[PDB]
């Protein structure tokens, strides 16, 4: 009944996270770059569903995650999946400013974006988060806690006690990273609520990003997997 | 649903 | 910037200040309301909300040192945000109702999943005894956060000032939680707690604009000119 | 826009 997470040290909780990572996917091997609707959302997509299986077994490796009853964890993931795929590109991304690294294969600029209809705007705002979190150096033990608390905190008040002590334990660990790294007790809060307050662009972007694959879903530019489908369809 | 199948595996 | 130079203390008493009034909607409990007229009621009042609104950003420390095209934007993103946080702060004291007036306390009974949503938020504020101090650092945080990540170097050095205003918000919040006794553990769980409850905000948010979306296509519900212009503005 | 003017008063 009770949850091991709970018991985990931080040093514990960021090896767990770290090891519960999933590796970076490829694309397609073609030389040819992206400049249709179709060939593009047909990458993208393809992409996503890859990454859905990974990240559904990423999620049962969180701590605390498995805990739940299988309902929760179908309602977590259903809310938090494209928030999570997003902020994995972006984290992919800070490197290289200016694009978008969906993999390693396939490097995108906004320029590619201007192709689809109504994405280049969610491109854009993506390349900002990216942007920003290299200007605040983010450190990849900051990333899997913020990318862990997305799981946890997204679909958390549509329940809706054991998420809410277990996103406590995510926020202590944070800021045990960010004392280990060396910043003063000032910075570490204001650290740790600049990181938070990007959470609310990141969800932003999701809803955004929601209803363009809706819109593409009804103009049946490429199918979807049945997966895909069911992820969006839960977004209602 | 697939998510409930997959979370199983 | 005067904001700048603010205490904590007095960045409280200033936003504090500033509060806009809670106003009354036309709703009467003699007539009958169709769900479209109900609609319009809350309209109505979402229509007078902006207006005393719109002044009172005037007054969050920081807010009128930018340019008007970027209180422009920041307002457009954020008011939908900021009437909501309102309107869960004020049905705080009220389980299982939303107090949209003084003279309008609703159940989800009497748009249903946003009611819920909004339901959740104010029993989160409960679960947490949210102080009035820490709302209105809140609400402010909204209005400057929620459109700075959508705008030369010159627009550049807008948003570092947003940045370095809200990087006092933060400070204000940890100062009132140190205040209330709160060990240094508690008070990072707390600024986090209190942080992603803006995520779940603006998710209420959004879906509200696209059934604002439909609510105009439709053509059912009077909408306000200056809604409308709201609305566009989401595109 | 409305809320320009309004910002501007
Ligand atoms: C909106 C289509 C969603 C497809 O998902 C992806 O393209 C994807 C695949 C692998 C990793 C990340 C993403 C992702 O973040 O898509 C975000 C996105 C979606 C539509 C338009 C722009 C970006
Ligand atoms: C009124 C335009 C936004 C659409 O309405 C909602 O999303 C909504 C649905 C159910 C309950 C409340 C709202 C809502 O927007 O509440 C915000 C609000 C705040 C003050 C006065 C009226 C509405």
Known sequence: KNSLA??????????????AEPPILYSEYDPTRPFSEASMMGLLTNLADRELV?????????????????????????????????????????????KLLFAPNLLLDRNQGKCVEGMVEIFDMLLATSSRFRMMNLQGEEFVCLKSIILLNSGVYTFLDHIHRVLDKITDTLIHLMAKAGLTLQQQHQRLAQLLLILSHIRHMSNKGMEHLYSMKCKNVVPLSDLLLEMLDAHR | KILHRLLQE
């Open chain 1, 6 to 19: 709970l018991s985990l040290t931080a040093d514990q909780m960021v090896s767990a996270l770290l090891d």
């Open chain 1, 54 to 98: 990974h990240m559904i077994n990423w999620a049962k490796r969180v701590p605390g995650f498995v805990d739940l009853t299988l309902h929760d964890q179908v309602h977590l993931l259903e809310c938090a999946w494209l928030e999570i795929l997003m902020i994995g590109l972006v984290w992919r991304s800070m490197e290289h400013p200016g």
